[PDB]
Amino acid sequence: SMEQVAMELRLTELTRLLRSVLDQLQDKDPARIFAQPVSLKEVPDYLDHIKHPMDFATMRKRLEAQGYKNLHEFEEDFDLIIDNCMKYNARDTVFYRAAVRLRDQGGVVLRQARREVDSIG
Numbered sequence: 001s002m003e004q005v006a007m008e009l010r011l012t013e014l015t016r017l018l019r020s021v022l023d024q025l026q027d028k029d030p031a032r033i034f035a036q037p038v039s040l041k042e043v044p045d046y047l048d049h050i051k052h053p054m055d056f057a058t059m060r061k062r063l064e065a066q067g068y069k070n071l072h073e074f075e076e077d078f079d080l081i082i083d084n085c086m087k088y089n090a091r092d093t094v095f096y097r098a099a100v101r102l103r104d105q106g107g108v109v110l111r112q113a114r115r116e117v118d119s120i121g
Contacts, residue, residue, distance in 0.1 A: 014117070015066050018074050021113045022063060025078060026056050028105040033098045034081050049088050054080035071117045075110060 029035070037055045038046050046053065059077050068074040085099040 010121075011066050011069070013120070014068070014070070015063060017113065017116060017120075018063055018068055018071070021074070021109060022056070022059060024109045025102070025106045028102050028109075029056070029098065031094075031098055033095060034085070034102065046088070050084045052080055052084075054078075054084060056081070071114060078106065078110075 026035070035056050037053055037058060038050075040046055054077050059074075059081075062068060062077070063074075068077075082099045082103045085095055089095040089099075
């Protein structure tokens with residue numbers, strides 16, 4: 001149907017906008033602390049602590065399959081990156097601190113992304 005095509009175009013355009021958001025948030029992590037999944041070979045207990053691991057590569061795979069239906073879903077995954085890190089790592093660590101800085105900086109980007117998603121529809 002033409003209705004199904006139109007919906008698919010909206011999903012494609014959302015995907016374009018989330019790709020640009022993802023790039024912007026990842027630039028706020030110049031250390032690349034959140035670039036890849038936590039290795040279970042290197043942190044064998046991780047899944048005892050963290051039940052839903054997340055990282056920027058995993059988000060990018062989902063994005064490219066057009067697997068985010070709305071901005072809420074995308075923000076959920078970004079929040080998991082931050083929140084997982086702040087639980088696993090102590091306050092005095094470079095990892096925790098990197099997450100705080102990513103959260104603070106990413107807030108700015110996400111605030112305007114919401115306006116744009118509502119605005120363009």
